[PDB]
Design an enzyme around this catalytic site. Structure first.
Site, mmCIF file in Angstrom:
data_model
loop_
_atom_site.group_PDB
_atom_site.id
_atom_site.type_symbol
_atom_site.label_atom_id
_atom_site.label_comp_id
_atom_site.label_asym_id
_atom_site.label_seq_id
_atom_site.Cartn_x
_atom_site.Cartn_y
_atom_site.Cartn_z
ATOM 1 N N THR A 1 0.818 -1.204 0.000
ATOM 2 C CA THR A 1 0.000 0.000 0.000
ATOM 3 C C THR A 1 0.855 1.258 0.000
ATOM 4 O O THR A 1 2.047 1.191 0.274
ATOM 5 C CB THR A 1 -0.943 0.028 1.211
ATOM 6 O OG1 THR A 1 -1.767 1.196 1.151
ATOM 7 C CG2 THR A 1 -0.161 0.033 2.495
ATOM 8 N N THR A 2 0.258 2.401 -0.335
ATOM 9 C CA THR A 2 0.941 3.677 -0.167
ATOM 10 C C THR A 2 -0.074 4.767 0.152
ATOM 11 O O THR A 2 -1.150 4.834 -0.446
ATOM 12 C CB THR A 2 1.802 4.060 -1.390
ATOM 13 O OG1 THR A 2 2.418 5.332 -1.165
ATOM 14 C CG2 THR A 2 1.023 4.094 -2.689
ATOM 15 N N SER B 1 3.723 0.304 1.940
ATOM 16 C CA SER B 1 4.781 -0.453 1.283
ATOM 17 C C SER B 1 5.451 0.352 0.185
ATOM 18 O O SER B 1 6.641 0.162 -0.081
ATOM 19 C CB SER B 1 4.224 -1.744 0.698
ATOM 20 O OG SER B 1 3.722 -2.579 1.721
#
Lengths: 203, 227, 227, 227, 227, 227, 227, 227, 203
Positions: free
Chosen positions: A1-2, A129
């Site tokens: 994810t970001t 991530s």
């Protein structure tokens, strides 16, 4: 994810991607990681999905109870301190989540809270991530003299680079600019597609 | 000789101590509310007091959510503890179900809390009645919760010292689905006809919701229109 | 001098406080029910009140399941707390056995709960009687649970202020296995003969089940037939 | 002035509150039982009530096992809670020892439970007496457990309003090891001689066991023989 | 006005409530015992009752071990709860020390238990006195435990309604180390001289131990010798 | 006959025990405060006592923070326990939110604590009223918390024996946003007009805050100016 | 009207209930003790009772260690529970410090235990006073612990019904550091001068310690010398 | 009729039970203390009693540290329990902060403990007042803690039966910073002028500290100088 | 990280660096590790961020409650003893933090408390990852006869050597000199830049 949260002059811009996995196996192509937590502040999500959603429900609960009892919005240092106390009262059965709360009370703030409850201000922060890619582009292109449009274009370029270079990141970017004048407003997906087609980040 | 404990019935079978808490409600100022075409309102009489008092903290009407609100009458200490419990139970309902889905078991939390104290010795009941009102998944709601805990869904009611006269008026005058303004003026006439002779109705706080909208409280000059 | 505590007997050996809770039941309005050829019904008198009241929340009859239902008489606060406990105990029974197998120990849960408060000081009993009715693995059931907790399986009963007159009628008129309609009209005549002179029977709520079917409540115009 | 609390003795040293629970037993209908040649029986008077009552739930005799049974007299609420505790204690004894080995400490569980409430304030005693009877590893058993908790093994007894007259009869007429039928008719004569003049003995429930067999309850027409 | 609570002293400094439990002991039938040349005995008066009663369960003397035994007087419910606690404490002493080493702190367990209830409000004392007797590592023991808890080692005592007359007899007649038979007949004469005029001493239960032997209860015809 | 327990209402529905705690407040010396143009102050009358007393510990005004302060009137024991709870509650609010964000739920904690004791038996209320004042994220605050727990935001008030006369003065003389000095002298005139004839106003402790600044207490010679 | 609860003071400020426990002590027989040249003794009057009583269990003097001992006066039940608590606290002190280092906080354990019951409702105090005496690391000790718990170190005292007369004698006759025999005879004269006219001093139990030695109790013929 | 419970206020709003504990303090002997040029002292009157009493344990002054000390007046049992709690709280303060940094919250521990018992039913207050005195990081301290718990820092005070007369003397005679000897003689004159006519001041215990030094108690012949 | 606390004649000087990681990945280039814990004493932070901030909040709380109740500042041995008791009451669910409290009450003190609650005075102390470098330069250059200006120059040279030789240390040094006369004063960042440019530690 970001996730990403950027503080500029009189506004703070936050955006996530929308992809949930939950396995290796990207399972949900349209999640929800950016939450409006009060009328002038929001929260992003970059950890375990269930624990993160329970944290969002508790913070919506406590901040709405706050606004109802005291009839004023909670300060950003106060909500991040409360969130730190919650994450640190239980750390040996901890919440595996990386939080990032941002909003405006008399000045735009964005704080970054880890899984152990360490809150610390920064002018731009990111969790997830795909975080180091957006830290690279924010380190190379960020300016504190930006406008809201240049800021949201920087945010979209950041999350686009993280989607290009990271597997767990992907999906359509949802961006929400919170300012004092207009309040928490989330950009519609057609406007975000227009910014992507303008910046040349579509393929 | 039986009206001394909360836990003793009478030769008729009455709980006087509960009824005396209901009498303690009767000493509070009148507050009414009704539902209408897509939404509900609340009206609360206030005999205007010390100008030293910040007007922010004499409001009998209180927001328990953006989408549930209520008004009290009786003991002010118990009244504030009750609206606190209503708020906290709204937050607990909202965190376990994602949203305040229906107003009814918010008022069930409040009602069971108020009922429990009418049963155990060493505890007195709450001398407050509450009128809840809002919009849910179903639509306009309007309840009243009394000291014994009894809740009932209405289309219009009052509480307080006027309650009988206001419900007597609304019992022969209220017609449902009025557009908001006409409803408010009917409720103002209801509140007027509960005072005693010579008393002039001062400015009462009034607030409303419509379906799909949030709360708003009419400020004193929007109130001043219907005088 | 002995009717002040729940825990004191008398020179006869009487628990007056329990009897006064039973007297508190007697001030509630009459509600009856009986079983018939494959199923049970319930009838409940309602002297029609304020048209401001949403009719959805004055129903003395309440669904504790799709396959168990009941009706109360007495204190309205204790009445609602009791029908809540009946619902929650039905759910606990259904989760531990897969289904509400027998109505009997749903009513045992409610009965033991109501009995316990007739024994310990610092607690008053419930001033409510309840009439349960439904279909189980066995068939049509019909109970009444009183303030002391005492449950008994019947073929017909009432509770409330009329109870003696209604059970007096049914004691000399009721014949089992009536087809549903004829049963209902017998029960309406039973409810009629409990009022006082001059009183006209208004519209009472009536509901029934047959074996293999779910619940239904006769709406006011299906009720209006048997007037 | 001393008969108000369960925990206060008198200048003689009497516990009146316990004796008033014993008086509450005395208002219940008479029930007797005795052992005979390989087994025990129980007889229970019932003044026949409302035909609306399902006869399954007015039985004073109750099966606590296939091999232990009992009968009550006194408060019907406490009576049912007690036969429940007898059943649950029978199951606990049966799970810790593989079988209900001896009836005596089933009745000890019940007796210690009933005794404890005759000692602590804030609790009233049970106003019920119980007569247990069955077959164990030893043979025919027959006890009576009173409100104070006192248990005694008998060869014949009664409880209830007749108890003195029935034990007076059996005290001069009972002879042990009667074959079942002759025993039953002796017990019926015992039950007869406890009524008042003009009263006709209606049909009483009677049930028995023999050694190595299970329970059976004589149905109303096998009962009807000994009228 | 001070004899109502267990926790209130008087202008002399008296605990009347404890004394009234001691008065409740006084209404029980006389039971005595003494030690002799290698062992102790116990004698207990029984006015013979209903032949319907199984004689196995009217024995005032009870075996708390093969090597400790006791006899009660007072309330029969408290009496049985006490002999139960004596048995359970004997088993706990025997499991922590491998054997009932000395009878004294078995009686200390019972004594502390009986004393504690003479001190706390909301609890009444036990209305029973107990006389323990047996053989230990030391030899013949003989105690009495009263309602307040007070234990004393004796060479001879009684409890019950005769107690003063029996201890008055033994106070001028008892000589130690009698061979068992002569001791028993002395104790029978002691029990005889406590009755009232016209009363004939019926058959009392008597039991004994000698050092190195177990218990035995003289059956009714070995008892019948000393009449 | 109802003013003996905290948990009993009256035929009007009054809680007299709460009102008598409010009467206990009335025996304390007068203390007032108001907000002004960017800040709030507090004034407290002190009839000057023993010069043996260290003046550091007779201050009715107490710092609960650098940015919240209060003053009491009533029982001095309960007064000190309350200002301790206010301090500890300020520290708990400050540790969970990083700073004392709003004064309001510091006073809510104190209020709920004082309210709870007006409801349970076996506890008496606090006989103290408290006036809180400070600067938060919102600005100047000014509350009063009474024995029942009731809090109200004001622009000016008093507590103590003068309270009615001081609020009567301020009710017709106070004008908001006075520059600090003019405000103080208005409050001194308010405090003056509450004494009785012949009494000379001695030196009262007075302290204030402005927005963005900390606390300061005017020392006795800065106080001595406004005499 | 105030001498009914342990927790209520009087218009003078007296705890009558504690004083009534002190009166309960006054009905016990006199027991004295003093220290001398290297050691302490204890003397205890006993009006000789039933020869059926084993003399081992009427000793008012009791060994709480080989190096601490005490004597009681008052209620015999509370007396024994107290000497038990003294023994158990001696063992706890000895296990946490390796040895009974000082007698003083053995008596502090006993004193705090006796004091606590003079403060809480639902509990009565102990109606016993205790006189401790022994040798520690410091030397000869001699305390008295009263019902309220108050302990004081003496060089000579008594308790019981004579206490005033004995302490009156010792107050004008006692001289410290007497060699053991002379001390004992002084204490015997002290005990003599507390009786009433006509009463002859029977044989009292007396026991002593010297520094570095253990306990010994003078047997009846070493006692018989000082008659 | 209101001075029976600790939890009931009066028509004025008075807690009489607390005031009667304060009256119980008044029956104790006078004890005073004051601070001076670098340090504080304490003086305590003792009417000389039985020479059998070891003088080590009649000292009203007690060392709670090498650097904090106090003196009591009132009930001797509660007095000792209180000085014990002061010692234990000094040790807890010293272990959590490395040293007794300030005397003030040692006295806060004692004060909150004494206050709590003036609020809950089923507990009586302490009938003792305490005067603390010592050297801390700040310097000479001098407090008094009363039954309600109220603490105040003084430069001179007394407690006990003389308290009003001694504080009346010191109120017009005491001048600060006296060198130790002159201070002591002023305090002796203060103690003298509180007795009644004919009474001769016996030898009182007096003890002091100076800044940087430890405690010392003037022995009887250094005391004997100032007679 | 690196913290330092130096006691000289009538003052005690404490300084930290400002860099938070929280990952490997230095995430916050401007943290806050030096806290004013009371009006005449401060505390530095060299452990886990969340646990350390909770410790700072509790110590600010207890010392302000102290000053309010008793109206005098808490002694330095008393605050370090309290901090040791807090860290040692829970050591099997411990706070992974290295603390260093310093201040002045009647004499300047600096104490060093480890994660198990062992407090011990020293004339100069340091905690953190870059601690041995500042102990080297303090061992070679420290003098007890220094002034406040020579002390703060020594402190800046120390933290500069630790930043040059350590990865987790970095960012702008914030220094706060606490003395009895002027109270707790923290040097502004322009003055610290001026001292760096004077000492020749800028590149």
């Amino acid at each position: 994810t970001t996730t990403v949260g950027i503080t500029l002059k009189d506004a703070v811009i936050m955006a996530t991607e929308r992809r949930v996995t939950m396995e290796n196996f990207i399972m949900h192509k349209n999640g929800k990681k950016l939450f409006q937590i009060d009328t002038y502040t929001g929260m992003t999500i970059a950890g375990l999905v269930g624990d993160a959603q329970v944290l969002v429900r508790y913070m919506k609960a406590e901040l709405e109870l706050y606004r109802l009892q005291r009839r004023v919005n909670m300060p950003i240092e106060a909500v991040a301190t409360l969130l730190s106390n919650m994450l640190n009262q239980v750390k040996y059965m901890p919440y595996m989540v990386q939080l990032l709360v941002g909003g405006i009370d008399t000045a735009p703030h964005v704080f970054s809270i880890d899984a152990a409850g360490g809150s610390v201000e920064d002018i731009y922060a990111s969790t997830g991530s795909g975080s180091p890619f957006v830290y690279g582009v924010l380190e190379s292109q960020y300016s504190e003299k930006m406008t809201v449009d240049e800021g949201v274009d920087l945010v979209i370029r950041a999350i686009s680079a993280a989607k290009q270079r990271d597997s767990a990141s992907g999906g359509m970017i949802d961006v929400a600019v919170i300012t004092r004048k207009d309040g928490y407003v989330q950009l519609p997906t057609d406007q975000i597609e227009s910014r992507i087609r303008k910046l040349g980040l579509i393929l | 000789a039986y009206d001394r404990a909360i836990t003793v019935f009478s030769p008729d079978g009455r709980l006087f101590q509960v009824e005396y808490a209901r009498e303690a409600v009767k000493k509070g100022s009148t507050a009414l509310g009704m539902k209408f075409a897509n939404g509900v309102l609340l009206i609360s009489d206030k005999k205007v007091r010390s100008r030293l008092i910040e007007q922010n903290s004499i409001e009998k009407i209180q927001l328990i959510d953006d989408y549930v609100a209520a008004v009290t009458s009786g003991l002010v200490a118990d009244a504030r503890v009750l609206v606190d419990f209503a708020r906290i139970s709204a937050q607990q309902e909202k965190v376990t179900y994602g949203s305040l889905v229906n107003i009814e078991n918010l008022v069930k939390r409040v009602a069971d809390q108020m009922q429990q104290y009418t049963q155990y010795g060493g505890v007195r009941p709450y001398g407050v009645s509450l009128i809840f009102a809002g919009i849910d998944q179903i639509g306009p709601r309007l309840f009243d919760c009394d000291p014994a805990g009894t809740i009932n869904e209405y289309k219009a009611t009052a509480i307080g010292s006027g309650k009988d006269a206001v419900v007597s008026f609304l019992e022969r005058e209220y017609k449902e689905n009025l557009p908001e303004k006409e409803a408010v003026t009917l409720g103002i006439k209801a509140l007027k006809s509960s005072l005693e002779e010579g008393e002039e109705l001062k400015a009462p706080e009034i607030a409303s919701i419509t379906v799909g909208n949030k709360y708003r409280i009419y400020d004193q000059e929007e109130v001043k229109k219907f005088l």
